[PDB]
Amino acid sequence: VLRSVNSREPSQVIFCNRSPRVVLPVWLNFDGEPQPYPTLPPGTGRRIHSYRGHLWLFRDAGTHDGLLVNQTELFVPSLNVDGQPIFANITLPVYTLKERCLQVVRSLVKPENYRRLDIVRSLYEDLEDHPNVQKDLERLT
Amino acid sequence: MMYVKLISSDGHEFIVKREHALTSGTIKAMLSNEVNFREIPSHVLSKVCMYFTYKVRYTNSSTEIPEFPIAPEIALELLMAANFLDC
Amino acid sequence: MDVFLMIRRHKTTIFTDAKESSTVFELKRIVEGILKRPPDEQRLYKDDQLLDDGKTLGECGFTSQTARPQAPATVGLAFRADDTFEALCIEPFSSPPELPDVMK
Ligand SMILES: CC(=O)N[C@H](C(=O)N1C[C@H](O)[C@H](F)[C@H]1C(=O)NCc1ccc(-c2scnc2C)cc1)C(C)(C)C
């Protein structure tokens, strides 16, 4: 279902990382497989050549936490008007306080020790269920 | 402007807008003008109140969003309280 | 520009916002509505300094980039009972426990 269209029609884009995280762009190829591309440090940008009808999403390169692009999940390059590139603003979402707490804890405790923590079993499951690109694709289908 | 009182386990009394507090479905229920929390110390409940302010200021804003900060000392207790309050 | 504050006296803390251009007196009006005490029975503070009614919050150092939603600035509050003002007193928050072994 979710896959780039093989249009072969170029589209110039700016990836602009307005987050404090190191960013990993992910191109969904013609069979729907996620393909990683080089990372962007916080506050940096890249001018890149993509194509009309292609699908991208964006992640934290180290924890795989999900990020937003022009306020939403998926970004699809469109027609360039007047030879101007399409802007792709990558930002932090307003995470729930719960999901933020999980991020920090995951970054402090090694996965082998989640169980040694003093919390209810369903929070152990919430910690072990770290963000994953495959799951989010299944969700968004 | 309506306000409500949220009270920590150690007696600290925090006073916030009614609109902000209703971010939590759990608090919405405990009202439908004061609420006592017997498990939540003030060093956690203050951070919860700051999250309300943060969420309402940055929800659906096209400006850049800063990270909501959490000290390692308070991360576990805060996790438990956010799970309970559903925020 | 909005500034975000905690107004604190004893074990009371108020979360609210105000304009950088608004006055100290106008902030007491806000307290009056919540705690039912008129401005003439209130003193406000930045740390140990008493604040003048006519001055703006910006003049007194509360700016939009220091007084943020996720990290608001603190403003001290003290009441008058009868003739004289109480001393400014703010109870600290609780202490976090020690970090567990697995977080060190
Ligand atoms: C005709 C077609 O669809 N070509 C694809 C293509 O050229 N793509 C797929 C995406 O549209 C992507 F944009 C483009 C591509 O790979 N462009 C080169 C490229 C290289 C590095 C980067 C990035 S991402 C973060 N930093 C950089 C330098 C972005 C684009 C193939 C070669 C991967 C099949």
From Swiss-Prot, chain A:
Effect of Y51H: In VHLD; type IIA
Reported impact of C101W: In VHLD; type I-II
GO molecular function, a single term: DNA-binding transcription factor binding
GO cellular component: cilium; cytosol; endoplasmic reticulum; intracellular membraneless organelle; microtubule cytoskeleton; mitochondrion; nucleoplasm; nucleus
Effect of W27R: In VHLD; type I
Effect of W56C: In VHLD; type I
Consequence when changing S19N: In PCC and VHLD; type I
Effect of F30L: In cerebellar hemangioblastoma; uncertain significance
Entry's Gene Ontology BP terms: amyloid fibril formation; cell morphogenesis; cellular response to hypoxia; negative regulation of apoptotic process; negative regulation of autophagy; negative regulation of cell population proliferation; negative regulation of gene expression; negative regulation of receptor signaling pathway via JAK-STAT
Effect recorded for L97P: In VHLD; type I-II; abolishes release from chaperonin complex and the interaction with Elongin BC complex
The keyword Heme belongs to this UniProt entry's keyword annotation: no
Pathway: Protein modification; protein ubiquitination
Known outcome of mutating K98E: In VHLD; type II
Tissue: Expressed in the adult and fetal brain and kidney.
Result when mutating D82E: In VHLD; type II
Phenotype when changing Y95C: In PCC and VHLD; type I
Impact upon substituting P25L: In VHLD; type I
Coiled-coil spans in chain: none
Substitution effect: P25A: In VHLD; type I
Phenotype upon changing T44P: In VHLD; type I
Stated family: Belongs to the VHL family.
Entry function: Involved in the ubiquitination and subsequent proteasomal degradation via the von Hippel-Lindau ubiquitination complex. Seems to act as a target recruitment subunit in the E3 ubiquitin ligase complex and recruits hydroxylated hypoxia-inducible factor (HIF) under normoxic conditions. Involved in transcriptional repression through interaction with HIF1A, HIF1AN and histone deacetylases. Ubiquitinates, in an oxygen-responsive manner, ADRB2. Acts as a negative regulator of mTORC1 by promoting ubiquitination and degradation of RPTOR.
Name of the featured protein: von Hippel-Lindau disease tumor suppressor
Full protein segment contained here: 62 to 202 of 213
Swiss-Prot record, chain B:
InterPro entries, per database record: ELC1, SKP1-like, SKP1/BTB/POZ_sf, Skp1_comp_POZ
PTM comment text: Ubiquitinated by the DCX(AMBRA1) complex, leading to its degradation by the proteasome.
A Pfam match: Skp1_POZ
Gene3D superfamilies: Potassium Channel Kv1.1, Chain A
Any GO BP annotation: transcription initiation at RNA polymerase II promoter
Tissue: Overexpressed in prostate cancer cell line PC-3 and breast cancer cell line SK-BR-3.
Top-level taxonomic group: Eukaryota
Segments traversing the membrane: none
Keyword match Transcription: yes
Keyword tags: Host-virus interaction, Nucleus, Transcription, Transcription regulation, Ubl conjugation, Ubl conjugation pathway
UniProt pathway annotation: Protein modification; protein ubiquitination
CC terms in the record's Gene Ontology section: Cul2-RING ubiquitin ligase complex; Cul5-RING ubiquitin ligase complex; cytosol; elongin complex; nucleoplasm
Entry's localization field: Nucleus
Record keyword Transcription present: yes
MF terms in GO: protein-macromolecule adaptor activity; transcription corepressor binding
Assembly description: Heterotrimer of an A (ELOA, ELOA2 or ELOA3P), ELOB and ELOC subunit. The elongin BC complex interacts with EPOP; leading to recruit the elongin BC complex to Polycomb group (PcG) target genes, thereby restricting excessive activity of the PRC2/EED-EZH2 complex.
Family stated for the protein in its record: Belongs to the SKP1 family.
Known role: SIII, also known as elongin, is a general transcription elongation factor that increases the RNA polymerase II transcription elongation past template-encoded arresting sites. Subunit A is transcriptionally active and its transcription activity is strongly enhanced by binding to the dimeric complex of the SIII regulatory subunits B and C (elongin BC complex).
Protein name (record): Elongin-C
Species this chain originates from: Homo sapiens
Swiss-Prot record, chain C:
One cellular component (GO) term of this entry: elongin complex
Role summary: SIII, also known as elongin, is a general transcription elongation factor that increases the RNA polymerase II transcription elongation past template-encoded arresting sites. Subunit A is transcriptionally active and its transcription activity is strongly enhanced by binding to the dimeric complex of the SIII regulatory subunits B and C (elongin BC complex). Core component of multiple cullin-2 and cullin-5-RING E3 ubiquitin-protein ligase complexes (ECS complexes), which mediate the ubiquitination of target proteins. By binding to BC-box motifs it seems to link target recruitment subunits, like VHL and members of the SOCS box family, to Cullin/RBX1 modules that activate E2 ubiquitination enzymes. Component the von Hippel-Lindau ubiquitination complex CBC(VHL).
Location of the Ubiquitin-like domain: 1-66
Family indicated by similarity: Belongs to the Elongin B family.
InterPro entries attached to this UniProt entry: ELOB, Ubiquitin-like_dom, Ubiquitin-like_domsf
Originating organism: Homo sapiens (Human)
Entry-linked Pfam families: ubiquitin
Alphabetized UniProt keyword annotations: Acetylation, Host-virus interaction, Nucleus, Phosphoprotein, Transcription, Transcription regulation, Ubl conjugation pathway
Subunit (UniProt): Heterotrimer of an A (ELOA, ELOA2 or ELOA3P), ELOB and ELOC subunit. The elongin BC complex interacts with EPOP; leading to recruit the elongin BC complex to Polycomb group (PcG) target genes, thereby restricting excessive activity of the PRC2/EED-EZH2 complex. (Microbial infection) Following infection by HIV-1 virus, component of a cullin-5-RING E3 ubiquitin-protein ligase complex (ECS complex) hijacked by the HIV-1 Vif protein.
Name of the protein described by the UniProt record: Elongin-B
PANTHER family: ELONGIN B (PTHR13248:SF4), TRANSCRIPTION ELONGATION FACTOR B POLYPEPTIDE 2 (PTHR13248)
Gene expressing this chain: ELOB
Pathway where this protein functions: Protein modification; protein ubiquitination
Coiled-coil intervals, chain numbering: none
Primary location: nucleus
Residue list for modification N-acetylmethionine: M1
Keyword field contains Cytoplasm: no
Compartment(s) where it occurs, according to its Swiss-Prot or TrEMBL record: Nucleus
Keyword Cell division set for record: no
Residues found modified as Phosphothreonine: T84
